[PDB]
Design an enzyme around this catalytic site. Sequence first.
Site, short mmCIF file in Angstrom:
data_model
loop_
_atom_site.label_atom_id
_atom_site.label_comp_id
_atom_site.label_asym_id
_atom_site.label_seq_id
_atom_site.Cartn_x
_atom_site.Cartn_y
_atom_site.Cartn_z
CG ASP A 17 -6.10 -9.42 -7.70
OD1 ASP A 17 -5.10 -9.07 -7.06
OD2 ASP A 17 -7.15 -8.74 -7.81
CB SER B 80 8.34 -4.29 4.72
OG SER B 80 9.69 -4.07 4.39
#
Length: 330
Positions: A35, A199
């Site tokens: 994770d 992004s």
Amino acid sequence: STGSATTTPIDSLDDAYITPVQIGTPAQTLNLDFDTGSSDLWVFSSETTASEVDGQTIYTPSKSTTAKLLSGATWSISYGDGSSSSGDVYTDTVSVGGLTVTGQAVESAKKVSSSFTEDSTIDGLLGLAFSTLNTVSPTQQKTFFDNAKASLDSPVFTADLGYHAPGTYNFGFIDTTAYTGSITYTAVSTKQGFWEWTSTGYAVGSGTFKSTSIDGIADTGTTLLYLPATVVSAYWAQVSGAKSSSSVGGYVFPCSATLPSFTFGVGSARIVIPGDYIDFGPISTGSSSCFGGIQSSAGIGINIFGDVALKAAFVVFNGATTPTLGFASK
Ligand SMILES: O=C(O)CCc1nccs1
């Protein structure tokens, strides 16, 4: 040193991926959920409340000659999905794919929430976010990667998650045969303890690319892609019959639909998520209403590039002094 381990979807939807991890001496192999959005290595154990264990493999520290109780140490974690677990702490030898760390904090669960009990395929979590998020008290502990870093050939790990197929976690090296083209690296902020990056934009299907900054985290422990409501609305508007359902808990669509791809920007590069990766199947067995793999982050507080996004890429987690992320197509 290096390590390399195969990671395998737990079910036919790729809801999560499990990777075998050797703990203790002799080794006890548990299948952990790696994770990158958390920083505790915790396991079902011989200490876990018996009614909360339902098919998981447990770690028994009393059977490990290298286990040592970390005196006074406790841990307690709550995840973004509302699940939780807590317990005490041992140090022991932990190996992943041939890479061994001695003295790793292994957090033994005394209690786990129902969602963990109900998932017999996940024996615990191995956190790969920054150690500042580790919950051990009163002395915070380091992640497996942080402990291994100095010994690794290069201070990196890579995630290569499969679509409906096994994939690979590598430590200490970048497998140049595992991706196409080049890897585009992008800056990381560690201020929240995550692999947080920005992004450069998105496109829906064959549509034009929208240049816009989307801050979010690369999180292998989250199944779906959670993005701003504007972006998600633009995606689902291209799927006839799609609707956000408050009763189901997100966007749902007719199972008969063909989904468009979704592209996200990494610098000047583009990662394309095929439409099929965004199908999470019937909301309940036999339903013709399917659950979408792109959902709004509006109620989360952060955008999350979970498995839906990451499995479309070869992803480099560069843990150099100034960390960065790399993405390549594959
Ligand atoms: O429920 C409806 O109105 C039609 C069937 C659908 N299922 C999901 C999206 S549309």
